[model samples]
Target chain A: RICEVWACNLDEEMKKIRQVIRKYNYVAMDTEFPGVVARPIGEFRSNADYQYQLLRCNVDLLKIIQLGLTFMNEQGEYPPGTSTWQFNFKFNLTEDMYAQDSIELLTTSGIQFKKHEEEGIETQYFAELLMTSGVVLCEGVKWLSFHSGYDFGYLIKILTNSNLPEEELDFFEILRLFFPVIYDVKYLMKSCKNLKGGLQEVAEQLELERIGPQHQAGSDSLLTGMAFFKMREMFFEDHIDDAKYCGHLYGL
Target chain B: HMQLEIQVALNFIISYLYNKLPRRRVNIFGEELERLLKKKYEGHWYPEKPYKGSGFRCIHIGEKVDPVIEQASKESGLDIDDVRGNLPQDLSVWIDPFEVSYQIGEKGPVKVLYVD
Candidate 1:
């Protein structure tokens, strides 16, 4: 099940996360931000360069709205109960910059901005906990996400408390330091001809049912984990070497 | 030392400016601005890319540049210099068709550049 985390219960929730992540070290993460405000144009050396620039621009300008994290083990099993957690961050819609359509979509998906403003955790405090918390510091930890350029982009923004690096190589270097083993399921999806489109589409193709509503970080993150597990079983089996796909973000 | 990413970003801004205008009174205005920015800032551009959505195209120049701001002001007939001078050392400038806004640093309160 998905557990909701707010400012009031962040400390308690983090304590549980610390314990569970020791065993269930595979972290599947997703982030909800206001939306993209910047775009890249002109000729790029590669699609990766354009993608990196697109990520650099938007992540630098926007504030993260929510983060969804699901912890699992090598066996693709959760830590006994409610392994998914969604953390809401404080956002002031009046002052912050955001894409209008993104906010409207999130609103329609049932996210209450007013509730986030009043009850969400301070980003700085959450960043501090995330650094000290076992999630980042623990050993043998792995991370998973679907099309995760922005996911890691937002996380890196809060973790460093600074804008992203100038070059894509520098961004990759920083990402490697914090998240040593990372996999983008979207990139992995390329191995299979049948798997295509968004997370929901892939999930449907794999015959995996949605446990919760779409667009919500918690539910999406849980589904991402399940999808990865299903993909590994159906496609890779014993031939899978996760290292082959390490840090290969889909859009970048 | 002009970095490829900064050059590309500036080019994007130039393209945006040109595309936004029906036609440029002076084609050299955009070129001059890009050249001046490259000279002043070297390879540094706060954000090495542009926004992916339809909104204010914000870029952090990382410092105050009167000549660069003056060039933009001259083109747009907006006094961006006033806001640039009053703001702190590091600044992020937001540009849209209607107006220009600036902030002291990243995530700072945005103050609009006013005409008097």
Candidate 2:
């Protein structure tokens, strides 16, 4: 049977999560935001350049709808026998944060925009919660996100604007400070010439239990964690294409 | 640094696209580009007379109306009024953009829909 996923909105619930996360050293995170592109794509030098340019152009306009982090207390390898628990952190979005067409698209996916206010904690405290939290800044824990560059971009923009900054650091350097060892599943998949339809489709192709909401933030994170563990087994078996995988892309 | 290179690349793409397009700007008044370009007229198009006949007609409402004389009037202190009040109802031509009726209607206290 699949493990249970806990929901965290109030301080009490977050306190419970902090306790659970402290016992574990691995964190599989997933973020749900508005669409990737807020502007038109003209041309770029490489796929990496296109990805970087697009994030810089539109990361400010995009807002985090949900944040999902799954903590794993691992004892042995995959193929059964590893404990996992999940927590989905949701955020409220002001009216201005939503675009009409994007909201329409989300409604069709069964996520009502008006419901976010009642379902989530106000977003003003999210920056402080992440910055000062012991679970996030702990010594041994690792953070993993799927296709994390843009998510990190939005994370940086949101945090920096909340009256926290000093000087201009390079993009990779900034990310390195927050998440010392960040693994992007997209790089792992792309390096091995796998499917590119995204997490949902890729998870389905891997034959994992596709539970939880599809596009919703927390659900996607659960799927991402499932995919991560499955991919981890393959990595251990030395199935990955070592040459195609770029160690330079990962922040350590 | 890498940050400077990214900034430089983005700046280049903006200027490149700006110069690449034609000198004359293309403006689609209201209709979305796909449906506007293709042969599909949904909602309502105004000044229905222009596209009413067997084919569309370009009725130049404001041409060079005495350009030489207009220039002279400009120099002679704004006395030239080309007061052609509204054109006859039958001859009135409008090249107006197509309009879509998608007003957001509130059905309930929270539910909002674009009433078409």
Candidate 3:
């Protein structure tokens, strides 16, 4: 079952999370937010640099709507029950900045913006809880995401309570500090010839089943974890070195 | 550090700054800023968009303060001097809810004010 976390249950959920996360330390994450409002105009050093600027511009401007976390262990097993958690954050539609189409899409996909506005957890308070939740910067824990620049971007925003760094190197340095072991599943997909596309597409190709709604963060995080495990079994069977891709996000 | 008070003031200033500007396309100045940056930096702005629905927002003003001032002037239909004169000496707020940055002239450190 997916655990829905709001301000009312955040403290209780955090206690449960701290206990289970130590045993199931492989954390797969996904985030949903208002659509992008900025774009990079010109190009430069590499394709990676261009992507980084776009990420910086957009992330610097928006707020995350939801964050999903799925915990798994080495054998790709989740905790006893309710291992997936979805956290909704407070957002004001009239006051906050957002792309029209993106919000519409989320609405169609079954997110209740009004309820979230009224009952969602405050980002600053959540950030404080997360810092002490034993999931961040902890030994033996590894973070996973699918093409996750923005996922980490928003997470960093809350973690540091500031805007992203100007230099890409500085950004990577921060990633190293908070999440020592991180992997972009999209980057890993490059190693396989037949694998490509969005998380749902790639998961479909891998013959993985959808656990929840497509746009919802919790379901997507669970699917991302499933795909990573399948890829590991298929591609890295003989000599698996997850460390090779650590700290390498899909696009800078 | 009275960080909360600073954040409150920064939020007020951000709201006031945007409200003062003439209403046009919300992203017009952002696009203009990108264009100006491309012209000045040559082939150095990363061009690709991230995967869809990825959320994070911030603008780095670094040494491109001139372009920001120029774009603000263009967006408001005011002369560069007028725009620069009207802008705060130590800080400027960009469109969207992304950044509220502080700098002293062109040489000062660019500090992004954050709220808890």
Candidate 4:
């Protein structure tokens, strides 16, 4: 009955967003991978010495599957309001997603985006801005090869600080007990290749100047973030406690 | 001399600044080298610490180079446990930056760098 999706703070929806945050104290982040229709004919599983074809994800054509949840760190000092954090470039690009419809949005190609601002979700964003100029990576440790996508580094950046106010702390304690597998550090470094500088490292690279004819919101955000996260999983195995998870991290 | 001490401080500062700009400062080792540095220059260096930003200073001593730097098979390179390891001893420190070490060798100075 409930879902996490993009929400514009337009005049008509202000009240809905407020009431939602007031009651649930939680929010879910979602992405629509549109432009997922076009595909390379006959390369289902090939080892072509030199392959060639115009290709895109099937996401736009297939139904969307909700993958994860974004939690708000109570440390942000909430109640009055928790600050909104986004990848430096993404927050702005997302803002643009609401203002105009695009070629993808028009054709509703790929996994089309449907921004749904909630009237009962009080949760805020727990973005990893440390990648840019923040302190998480120290100095030499920061690198652009790591944080390009969703991986343990970003996961830990968020998960380590994933706490809740006294009233709602139960959910987190339980999550810590269950998802022990997600926060492996070595696995994180291997996954996000361009993640060296913290959240800010690849934020600039993720920016879209104009995609051929032009840029579109729905395609860039999810695809870039997803590609980056998946890559992180494939490279680093430090976060893995067991060899099996290590293998999984690298997609072995 | 304050100039020498300042040079050591300069080394510390240079390490961080170069890191931020995503570029290197040319001839850094040459220009920033401190001569007759007041041993304090090398121990526990922190750019910003308890007072304003002393952070900490580094502590260099025998144990650091001794355990690691031997008559390394190669020239000027120091080794411990096994000779010629990864980091060159000149800049890379062996003792924990924030702690103190009390070990001393026969002739040279007492352990100069440690946390406490």
Model 2: per-residue Cα lDDT over A1-252, one tens digit each:
124332344465455556666666566666656665466357766555555665666665666665666666453122222233333334345654555666667667656556555555445565666666665442566565677765666566655653212222456566666665655666554322223457878887777776555665556656666676666554223222222232224221
Instruction: State which candidate has the highest lDDT.
Output: 1
Standalone chain B TM-score for every prediction: 0.36, 0.16, 0.38, 0.21
Stretches of model 2 off by over 4 angstroms after superposition: A1-8, A40-50, A75-94, A162-169, A193-196, A238-252, B1-116
Runs in model 4 lying further than 4 Å from the true structure: A1-118, A122-175, A184-187, A190-194, A198-225, A232-252, B1-116
Error of 2 at A21 (Å): 1.4
The CAPRI category of model 4 is: incorrect
TM-score of 4: 0.21
User: Please, what are the lDDT tens digits per residue for candidate 1 over residues A67-118?
Assistant: 9999999989998878899998888899889999999999998799998989
lDDT of 4 by residue, A1-252 (tens): 212233332222333433433433322222222223445444433321112122112211222211222222222122333222121111222432222343246334332323221221112232322223222232222111111112221233243454221221333243233233233222232222223332233434444222111122222322333323333333322122232222122111
lDDT of 4 at B90: 27
Docking class of 1: incorrect
lDDT of 3 by residue, B36-63 (tens): 4334323222224211101111122221
What residue pairs are clashing in model 1? A37-B51, A38-B50, A38-B51, A38-B52, A39-B50, A39-B51, A39-B52
Error (Å) of candidate 3 at residue A249 is: 1.0
TM-score of 2: 0.53
* Fraction of native contacts, model 2: 0.00
Give lDDT per model, in order.
Answer: 0.71, 0.44, 0.70, 0.27
Q: What's the lDDT for residue A42 in model 1?
A: 62
Among all windows of 10 consecutive residues in model 2 chain A, the one with the lowest summed lDDT is A238-247
The TM-score of candidate 4's chain A against the true chain A comes to 0.23
